Design a protein around this motif. Sequence first.
Motif, PDB file in Angstrom:
ATOM      1  N   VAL A 204       0.844  -1.191   0.000  1.00  0.00           N
ATOM      2  CA  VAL A 204       0.000   0.000   0.000  1.00  0.00           C
ATOM      3  C   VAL A 204       0.888   1.252   0.000  1.00  0.00           C
ATOM      4  O   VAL A 204       1.881   1.342   0.746  1.00  0.00           O
ATOM      5  N   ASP A 205       0.600   2.212  -0.883  1.00  0.00           N
ATOM      6  CA  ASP A 205       1.354   3.469  -0.992  1.00  0.00           C
ATOM      7  C   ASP A 205       0.354   4.578  -0.790  1.00  0.00           C
ATOM      8  O   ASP A 205      -0.678   4.597  -1.478  1.00  0.00           O
ATOM      9  N   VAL A 206       0.594   5.406   0.212  1.00  0.00           N
ATOM     10  CA  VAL A 206      -0.305   6.505   0.482  1.00  0.00           C
ATOM     11  C   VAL A 206       0.426   7.852   0.335  1.00  0.00           C
ATOM     12  O   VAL A 206       1.554   8.073   0.803  1.00  0.00           O
ATOM     13  N   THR A 207      -0.222   8.741  -0.411  1.00  0.00           N
ATOM     14  CA  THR A 207       0.240  10.108  -0.592  1.00  0.00           C
ATOM     15  C   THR A 207      -0.658  11.030   0.235  1.00  0.00           C
ATOM     16  O   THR A 207      -1.858  11.188  -0.034  1.00  0.00           O
ATOM     17  N   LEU A 208      -0.085  11.654   1.252  1.00  0.00           N
ATOM     18  CA  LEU A 208      -0.846  12.483   2.162  1.00  0.00           C
ATOM     19  C   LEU A 208      -1.030  13.899   1.695  1.00  0.00           C
ATOM     20  O   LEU A 208      -0.111  14.491   1.117  1.00  0.00           O
ATOM     21  N   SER A 209      -2.230  14.410   1.888  1.00  0.00           N
ATOM     22  CA  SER A 209      -2.544  15.777   1.578  1.00  0.00           C
ATOM     23  C   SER A 209      -3.044  16.381   2.884  1.00  0.00           C
ATOM     24  O   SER A 209      -3.306  15.688   3.888  1.00  0.00           O
ATOM     25  N   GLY A 210      -3.187  17.702   2.904  1.00  0.00           N
ATOM     26  CA  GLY A 210      -3.632  18.417   4.088  1.00  0.00           C
ATOM     27  C   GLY A 210      -2.433  19.041   4.777  1.00  0.00           C
ATOM     28  O   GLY A 210      -1.437  19.393   4.138  1.00  0.00           O
ATOM     29  N   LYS A 211      -2.494  19.144   6.094  1.00  0.00           N
ATOM     30  CA  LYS A 211      -1.463  19.858   6.823  1.00  0.00           C
ATOM     31  C   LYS A 211      -0.383  18.909   7.275  1.00  0.00           C
ATOM     32  O   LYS A 211      -0.562  17.698   7.106  1.00  0.00           O
ATOM     33  N   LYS A 212       0.741  19.445   7.796  1.00  0.00           N
ATOM     34  CA  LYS A 212       1.802  18.650   8.439  1.00  0.00           C
ATOM     35  C   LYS A 212       1.269  18.376   9.821  1.00  0.00           C
ATOM     36  O   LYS A 212       0.667  19.249  10.448  1.00  0.00           O
ATOM     37  N   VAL A 213       1.566  17.200  10.330  1.00  0.00           N
ATOM     38  CA  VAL A 213       1.041  16.714  11.600  1.00  0.00           C
ATOM     39  C   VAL A 213       2.067  15.671  12.046  1.00  0.00           C
ATOM     40  O   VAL A 213       3.037  15.336  11.340  1.00  0.00           O
ATOM     41  N   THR A 214       1.883  15.199  13.272  1.00  0.00           N
ATOM     42  CA  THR A 214       2.628  14.043  13.719  1.00  0.00           C
ATOM     43  C   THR A 214       1.569  13.022  14.156  1.00  0.00           C
ATOM     44  O   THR A 214       0.703  13.364  14.979  1.00  0.00           O
ATOM     45  N   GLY A 215       1.551  11.808  13.611  1.00  0.00           N
ATOM     46  CA  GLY A 215       0.596  10.803  14.027  1.00  0.00           C
ATOM     47  C   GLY A 215       0.807   9.524  13.240  1.00  0.00           C
ATOM     48  O   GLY A 215       1.894   9.337  12.692  1.00  0.00           O
ATOM     49  N   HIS A 216      -0.173   8.615  13.237  1.00  0.00           N
ATOM     50  CA  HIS A 216      -0.075   7.405  12.473  1.00  0.00           C
ATOM     51  C   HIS A 216      -1.272   7.326  11.571  1.00  0.00           C
ATOM     52  O   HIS A 216      -2.321   7.908  11.869  1.00  0.00           O
TER      53      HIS A 216
ATOM     54  N   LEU B 299       3.761  13.549   9.428  1.00  0.00           N
ATOM     55  CA  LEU B 299       2.988  13.421   8.204  1.00  0.00           C
ATOM     56  C   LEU B 299       3.133  14.653   7.332  1.00  0.00           C
ATOM     57  O   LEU B 299       2.523  15.697   7.550  1.00  0.00           O
ATOM     58  N   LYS B 300       4.052  14.578   6.388  1.00  0.00           N
ATOM     59  CA  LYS B 300       4.323  15.699   5.506  1.00  0.00           C
ATOM     60  C   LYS B 300       3.363  15.574   4.338  1.00  0.00           C
ATOM     61  O   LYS B 300       3.280  14.478   3.777  1.00  0.00           O
ATOM     62  N   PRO B 301       2.598  16.583   3.937  1.00  0.00           N
ATOM     63  CA  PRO B 301       1.869  16.584   2.693  1.00  0.00           C
ATOM     64  C   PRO B 301       2.770  16.434   1.482  1.00  0.00           C
ATOM     65  O   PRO B 301       3.993  16.646   1.497  1.00  0.00           O
TER      66      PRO B 301
ATOM     67  N   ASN C  45      -3.721  11.791  15.779  1.00  0.00           N
ATOM     68  CA  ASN C  45      -2.710  12.812  16.023  1.00  0.00           C
ATOM     69  C   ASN C  45      -2.149  12.474  17.372  1.00  0.00           C
ATOM     70  O   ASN C  45      -2.902  12.218  18.311  1.00  0.00           O
ATOM     71  N   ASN C  46      -0.843  12.418  17.512  1.00  0.00           N
ATOM     72  CA  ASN C  46      -0.342  12.065  18.814  1.00  0.00           C
ATOM     73  C   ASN C  46       0.019  13.246  19.712  1.00  0.00           C
ATOM     74  O   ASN C  46       1.054  13.219  20.394  1.00  0.00           O
ATOM     75  N   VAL C  47      -0.797  14.318  19.702  1.00  0.00           N
ATOM     76  CA  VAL C  47      -0.669  15.423  20.654  1.00  0.00           C
ATOM     77  C   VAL C  47      -2.050  16.011  20.889  1.00  0.00           C
ATOM     78  O   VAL C  47      -3.024  15.744  20.164  1.00  0.00           O
ATOM     79  N   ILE C  48      -1.988  16.879  21.912  1.00  0.00           N
ATOM     80  CA  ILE C  48      -3.063  17.709  22.411  1.00  0.00           C
ATOM     81  C   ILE C  48      -3.046  18.864  21.407  1.00  0.00           C
ATOM     82  O   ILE C  48      -2.069  19.618  21.414  1.00  0.00           O
ATOM     83  N   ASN C  49      -4.015  19.003  20.489  1.00  0.00           N
ATOM     84  CA  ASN C  49      -4.008  20.111  19.535  1.00  0.00           C
ATOM     85  C   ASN C  49      -5.405  20.462  19.004  1.00  0.00           C
ATOM     86  O   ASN C  49      -5.921  20.019  17.959  1.00  0.00           O
TER      87      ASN C  49
ATOM     88  N   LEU D 263      -7.520  21.489  15.316  1.00  0.00           N
ATOM     89  CA  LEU D 263      -8.196  20.517  14.472  1.00  0.00           C
ATOM     90  C   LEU D 263      -7.526  20.578  13.090  1.00  0.00           C
ATOM     91  O   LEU D 263      -8.102  21.014  12.089  1.00  0.00           O
ATOM     92  N   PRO D 264      -6.242  20.155  13.002  1.00  0.00           N
ATOM     93  CA  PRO D 264      -5.569  19.937  11.712  1.00  0.00           C
ATOM     94  C   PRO D 264      -6.356  18.960  10.822  1.00  0.00           C
ATOM     95  O   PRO D 264      -6.967  18.016  11.352  1.00  0.00           O
ATOM     96  N   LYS D 265      -6.413  19.141   9.509  1.00  0.00           N
ATOM     97  CA  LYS D 265      -6.971  18.109   8.656  1.00  0.00           C
ATOM     98  C   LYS D 265      -5.908  17.443   7.755  1.00  0.00           C
ATOM     99  O   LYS D 265      -4.965  18.095   7.278  1.00  0.00           O
ATOM    100  N   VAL D 266      -5.991  16.124   7.563  1.00  0.00           N
ATOM    101  CA  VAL D 266      -5.063  15.335   6.771  1.00  0.00           C
ATOM    102  C   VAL D 266      -5.944  14.397   5.976  1.00  0.00           C
ATOM    103  O   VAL D 266      -6.928  13.882   6.516  1.00  0.00           O
ATOM    104  N   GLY D 267      -5.629  14.219   4.691  1.00  0.00           N
ATOM    105  CA  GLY D 267      -6.340  13.341   3.759  1.00  0.00           C
ATOM    106  C   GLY D 267      -5.297  12.521   2.955  1.00  0.00           C
ATOM    107  O   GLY D 267      -4.067  12.571   3.228  1.00  0.00           O
ATOM    108  N   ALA D 268      -5.749  11.724   1.977  1.00  0.00           N
ATOM    109  CA  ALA D 268      -4.824  10.975   1.155  1.00  0.00           C
ATOM    110  C   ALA D 268      -5.259  11.241  -0.278  1.00  0.00           C
ATOM    111  O   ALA D 268      -6.401  10.948  -0.681  1.00  0.00           O
TER     112      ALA D 268
END
Length: 449
Positions: A343-355, A377-379, A405-409, A412-417
């Motif tokens: 599986v290859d995922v290309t992330l869109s949205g904001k930079k974040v740290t998570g899984h 998670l780099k777009p 997201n692995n922090v208190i934030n 409400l960052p958004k991340v998509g693929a």
Amino acid sequence: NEVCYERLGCFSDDSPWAGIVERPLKILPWSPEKVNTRFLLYTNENPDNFQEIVADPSTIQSSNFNTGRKTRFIIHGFIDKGEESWLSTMCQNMFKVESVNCICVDWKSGSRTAYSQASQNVRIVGAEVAYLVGVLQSSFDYSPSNVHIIGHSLGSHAAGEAGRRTNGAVGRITGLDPAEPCFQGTPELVRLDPSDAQFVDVIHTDIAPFIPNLGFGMSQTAGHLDFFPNGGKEMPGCQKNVLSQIVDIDGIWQGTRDFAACNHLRSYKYYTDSILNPDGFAGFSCASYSDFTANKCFPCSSEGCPQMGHYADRFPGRTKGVGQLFYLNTGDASNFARWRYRVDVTLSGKKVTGHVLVSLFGNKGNSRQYEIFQGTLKPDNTYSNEFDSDVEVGDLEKVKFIWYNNVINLTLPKVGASKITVERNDGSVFNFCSEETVREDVLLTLTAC
Ligand SMILES: [Ca+2]
């Protein structure tokens, strides 16, 4: 010293059979009746209870043995507590998929003794099976290529001795974690090796050194195809043995010393599940296990992957070489079958740290959610990963995505693929695309593109 007996011939302790660095002690095999090898025949017409048979034409004709179907012998080695029906439940799975004469070879009397004596007694069991294969040939015109011998542990070397006595005419031998002490590194005469049958496939599950890691299985190659599921050293779901510079092999073999036998017994557990899951154990050619886990050996070679287990004889280049390496991972408990995906995922949205987790939905079912990546998670970036799914989804029709997201934030960052590409082990590729971006813990469906 040399002893000779009726039917089976002579046996001596001359080198290489004894007195060499790998097996120093000069000791002879016990006599045939002290080993008391027994042939317990189960067939589709008598699947629950055996018919005891002996190398005698009238006795064979009086049983349910049928010369119009294949014969598979199963020879044990180490028997752990509560594992004494493993041979008959391996035969009972075969009756679900084929017509077969399945013969369990019981030699408990000759194995329940000191390890070095049991190693020698393997020769008698070998001689006894070759002797029955011989009677079937001369009396029923039944070709040795219709027989398959399956041997586990010390029993895989009895299977080799039988194949050697049939001059390699035996159709197939499967070695299920061939025992190492007193066998690895010895000449072919003494151990299981590819000249013993037309096709030999081996499954390695406890290959760390006996001294001092207590892995009972050989690391050395012994078939045309050598499979190392989960790397061959530590099996998932099993306990590990503590390191010991000097070890008590007779206490271990005889069940009086403590030894976690989980790794060594997994070889026949995977073989039992392979019978009912004809595509659930694809082996990938790869130079090593670390290249495999580094995602460098997927999808299968173009002529298909070999199936580890019961169906390895369907593999098109099965005898083109000896010691051909195949790696794969299995489950941690039964059904052990797994199907690998990339599986290859290309992330869109904001930079974040998570899984980032993904789930596949196809016409035959959908999988669990697997983690593809954990970290920043780099777009625009693409993160790839291969996982072993416990469900075969079929033809993919959609894929789903979610991130945490692995922090208190509370921004409400958004991340998509933007695109997720799925490749199956046959090399077929499916693309799925999105315009969306989502907050954490929100499931995004992606449609084909
Ligand atoms: Ca041999």
